Design a protein around this ligand. Structure first.
Ligand SMILES: CCOC(=O)CC[C@H](C[C@@H]1CCNC1=O)NC(=O)[C@@H](CC(=O)[C@@H](NC(=O)c1cc(C)on1)C(C)C)Cc1ccc(F)cc1
Length: 181
């Protein structure tokens, strides 16, 4: 329902195709020159965005208050573009959902939407040997190439896709405070 239309608007204004040396990812533009990627994309000093090479001014790998990996990297892009500020749609606390849509946009998987259904609290995740906190899980067979995908519910941006085991998928939860100045 209304979830899907919200997801479509977010795609056009805030979701971009990127490529690093690690491959193709979806990127969420958060506000102005600030964006977020899965940590394992390992963005360097230059990144491909929508067929242009773009300088990266700064990058920070996010951890929680105890130091646990959140599997998210915040980057500031050297770009003319200024993302519409979508932080008001990110909840203050990690939020589950009943009818979520995953928004993917890479060169190999352009502009696609996947109804993943319920997104439930999971927490600690061992992701190919890398400990990760604050994850959520969906019972949907997500696949390689979908990392960075944005998990949304009606009027809420709740996660970034980071992994899966063939039958289930997992996202890093989003909190508004990650993006505070
Ligand atoms: C290399 C290409 O990379 C990509 O395409 C990025 C996106 C894919 C999407 C997966 C691809 C598959 N189904 C999915 O949804 N993500 C991964 O592959 C990650 C690994 C897993 O998902 C692992 N899963 C878990 O550990 C796992 C644990 C439980 C529990 O559930 N899944 C692998 C075993 C698949 C990549 C990763 C490697 C090292 C790290 F430090 C941290 C992350």
């Amino acid at each position: 329902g209304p979830s899907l239309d919200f997801a479509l608007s977010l795609l056009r204004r805030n979701v971009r195709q990127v490529q690093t040396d690690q491959g193709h990812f979806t990127m969420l533009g958060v506000r102005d020159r600030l964006a977020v990627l899965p940590r394992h994309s390992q963005p360097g000093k230059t990144i491909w965005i929508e067929h242009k090479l773009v300088n990266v001014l700064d990058a920070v790998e996010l951890v929680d208050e105890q130091g646990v990996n959140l599997e998210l990297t915040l980057i500031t892009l050297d770009t003319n573009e200024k993302f519409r500020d979508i932080t008001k749609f990110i909840p203050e606390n990690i939020s589950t959902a009943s009818d979520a849509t995953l928004v993917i946009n890479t060169e190999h998987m352009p502009s696609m939407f996947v109804p993943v259904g319920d997104v439930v609290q999971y927490g600690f995740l061992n992701l190919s040997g890398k400990p990760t906190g604050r994850t959520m899980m969906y019972n949907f067979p997500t696949k390689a190439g979908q990392c960075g995908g944005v998990v949304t519910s009606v009027g809420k941006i709740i996660g970034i896709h980071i992994g899966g085991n063939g039958r289930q998928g997992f996202c890093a939860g989003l909190k508004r405070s990650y993006f505070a100045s």
